Amino acid sequence: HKSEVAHRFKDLGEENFKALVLIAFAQYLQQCPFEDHVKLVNEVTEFAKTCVADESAENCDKSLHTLFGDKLCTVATLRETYGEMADCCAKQEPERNECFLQHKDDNPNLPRLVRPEVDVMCTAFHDNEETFLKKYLYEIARRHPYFYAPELLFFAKRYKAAFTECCQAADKAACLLPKLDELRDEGKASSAKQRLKCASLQKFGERAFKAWAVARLSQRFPKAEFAEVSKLVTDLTKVHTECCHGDLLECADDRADLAKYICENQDSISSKLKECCEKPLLEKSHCIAEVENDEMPADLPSLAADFVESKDVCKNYAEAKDVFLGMFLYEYARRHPDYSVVLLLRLAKTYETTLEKCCAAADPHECYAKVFDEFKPLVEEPQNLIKQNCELFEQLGEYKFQNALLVRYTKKVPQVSTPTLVEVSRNLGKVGSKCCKHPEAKRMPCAEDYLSVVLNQLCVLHEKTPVSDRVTKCCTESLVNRRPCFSALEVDETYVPKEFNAETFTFHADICTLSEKERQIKKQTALVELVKHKPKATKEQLKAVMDDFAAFVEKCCKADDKETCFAEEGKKLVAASQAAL
Ligand SMILES: CCCCC1C(=O)N(c2ccccc2)N(c2ccccc2)C1=O
Ligand SMILES: CCCCCCCCCCCCCC(=O)O
Ligand SMILES: CCCCCCCCCCCCCC(=O)O
Ligand SMILES: CCCCCCCCCCCCCC(=O)O
Ligand SMILES: CCCCCCCCCCCCCC(=O)O
């Protein structure tokens, strides 16, 4: 088409166009105030409308990069506020956009965003829904300049729906709060997944990413042909490489192209793509990215034939190693949607290590004839951990389950900071209440998805202020061995317990007037400090002390007079506990 802006404006729609332009500007000019951004959006939109009316109006022929760049260079304070970024304006567009990209700040220093009271939000929402939502949209985008724009818009729409619903209810707070917490967690998870995807692509390379995608796409589109799966994995790798570089326009066009390619060859890929392919341009790719697994052929051959029993295995493998291994991944993954992708990768790595050794020996067949027996122990490991932990989560509840994990991990890595241990254990706890509800067939994929982010949040932090070689080890190993590594950590027999600290175990009545989450976190913090002081303590000793603390807290919060009870009975509890331990 003769005009880029006009075309985009047309298939996006005015409302979507406006929100996206706002996000795009906020991610580049992270320091400019809201009023200035709104002003820019209005000018770009007004210009866009001119081009819609006549693709021949002036400047309507300019590319989007050029137009975006020219408007960015119009900001008068560009130099005084962003300094060096202002020098990007002296370059020819091609280089200009690259320069702006290089100067995008990922971890800016903006005040943390505080959640106001439910009634102020609801009142604000009713008085001016537009400015309320757009201002928060701006606040979120300036803080996450890397978050893929269209997905942020998808989140905004869900927030709107939460206010619309809850702000017109009897008990607003009881309605809205849980929705906001779920949205935030989900928002943070999405952010982590995006960063993880790019970092892994940079650290481990294209081959590893391609294997990961082959496995994932084969579980989802089992009826698709291997050649079709390879086509998709290739385009998908290119798409993420570009999206990770950070250029929104390039990223968006590649994704769109891929989404249409998929819809046009729908019948040749999966019968589950029907809905996704009838959705508007903006939602297509997102929908496809979450499509459920198509059902498998059910009348499929045995893997043993072509990969163990067959003659010429070594011959087909030597002829094209990666293609053969990819074929193996494809065949194995499409018969196992119940496996995590990383498990499939372990199987593949194991099959590769075996052919490398075995294909160089006299009688190949004999050497690699028992490969499938090496797979069994690899499979069972995550499966046992699932049942074992989910059952426990069932006996106890989410809270006591978190406490169980708390005792378990403080003992393995007592060096870690107490707030980190609490944070991590609580998140692990949630993965349990969220995945253990799924039937066995969907548990591993679920746990893998959530554990990948929790483990990455854990590693990133630790990276900053490292405290344990073991954690560093597990954090730097391959993403395939990451979870196994942590699971293999044993109690720290070297750790020297921390001296007693009266303060740490002193409690007041203010705990009675705290919110549930707040009470738990204070108790859990104490629970971690206890284990750090008495690491050799037993599950029984510990249970007894946690129970005394329990009755104690209920007793002191249920008395004609508090504070005294906590101080008087607190003296007791502490002294007794010490002796018992
Ligand atoms: C690496 C993360 C995986 C998310 C994902 C993605 O970005 N695309 C995706 C990319 C662009 C448009 C639509 C979907 N599809 C995808 C689905 C089937 C075949 C190929 C790719 C996905 O599953
Ligand atoms: C992209 C999301 C649109 C933003 C509009 C929703 C406003 C939510 C305000 C709450 C932000 C504070 C963060 C939190 O939830 O704790
Ligand atoms: C297009 C085919 C590309 C897939 C290549 C198959 C490679 C399988 C090896 C297992 C991948 C795990 C990589 C790793 O050890 O980090
Ligand atoms: C304590 C976390 C709560 C979930 C309980 C199951 C434990 C997850 C282990 C299985 C991980 C599957 C991913 C992998 O293959 O490594
Ligand atoms: C440094 C923070 C403490 C370490 C947290 C351990 C994380 C391991 C998660 C793996 C879940 C499987 C259960 C397990 O084997 O521990």
Swiss-Prot record:
Effect listed in the UniProt record for changing E356K: In Coari I/Porto Alegre
Keyword set, alphabetical order: Calcium, Cleavage on pair of basic residues, Copper, Disease variant, Disulfide bond, Glycation, Glycoprotein, Lipid-binding, Metal-binding, Methylation, Phosphoprotein, Repeat, Secreted, Signal, Zinc
Domain of life: Eukaryota
Residues reported to bind (4Z,15Z)-bilirubin IXalpha: K238
One BP annotation, GO: cellular response to starvation
Residues bearing glycans: 10, 49, 135, 160, 197, 223, 231, 274, 279, 311, 315-316, 321, 349, 376, 411, 437, 442, 492, 523, 532, 534, 543, 571
Database matches in InterPro entries: ALB/AFP/VDB, Serum_albumin-like, Serum_albumin/AFP/Afamin, Serum_albumin_CS, Serum_albumin_N
Consequence the record notes for mutating K534E: In Castel di Sangro
Residue positions, PTM N6-methyllysine: K532
Result for mutant: D561N: In Fukuoka-1/Paris-2
GO molecular function, one term: toxic substance binding
Residues binding Ca(2+) 1: E4, E242, D247, E250
Domain Albumin: 1-184, 185-377, 378-575
Binding residue positions for Zn(2+): H65, H245, D247
UniProt entry tagged with the keyword Lipid biosynthesis: no
Expression by tissue: Plasma.
Outcome (variant: D61N): In Malmo-95/Dalakarlia
Binding residues annotated for Ca(2+) 2, in chain numbering: D11, D253, D257
Predominant subcellular localization, coarse grouping: secreted
Modified residues (Phosphoserine): S3, S56, S63, S271, S417, S487
Annotated positions of the Phosphothreonine modification: T81, T418, T420
Family, per entry: Belongs to the ALB/AFP/VDB family.
Function: Binds water, Ca(2+), Na(+), K(+), fatty acids, hormones, bilirubin and drugs. Its main function is the regulation of the colloidal osmotic pressure of blood. Major zinc transporter in plasma, typically binds about 80% of all plasma zinc. Major calcium and magnesium transporter in plasma, binds approximately 45% of circulating calcium and magnesium in plasma. Potentially has more than two calcium-binding sites and might additionally bind calcium in a non-specific manner.
Disease per UniProt entry: Hyperthyroxinemia, familial dysalbuminemic: A disorder characterized by abnormally elevated levels of total serum thyroxine (T4) in euthyroid patients. It is due to abnormal serum albumin that binds T4 with enhanced affinity. Analbuminemia: A rare autosomal recessive disorder manifested by the presence of a very low amount of circulating serum albumin. Affected individuals manifest mild edema, hypotension, fatigue, and, occasionally, lower body lipodystrophy (mainly in adult females). The most common biochemical finding is hyperlipidemia, with a significant increase in the total and LDL cholesterol concentrations, but normal concentrations of HDL cholesterol and triglycerides.
Annotated protein name in UniProt: Albumin
Natural source organism: Homo sapiens (Human)
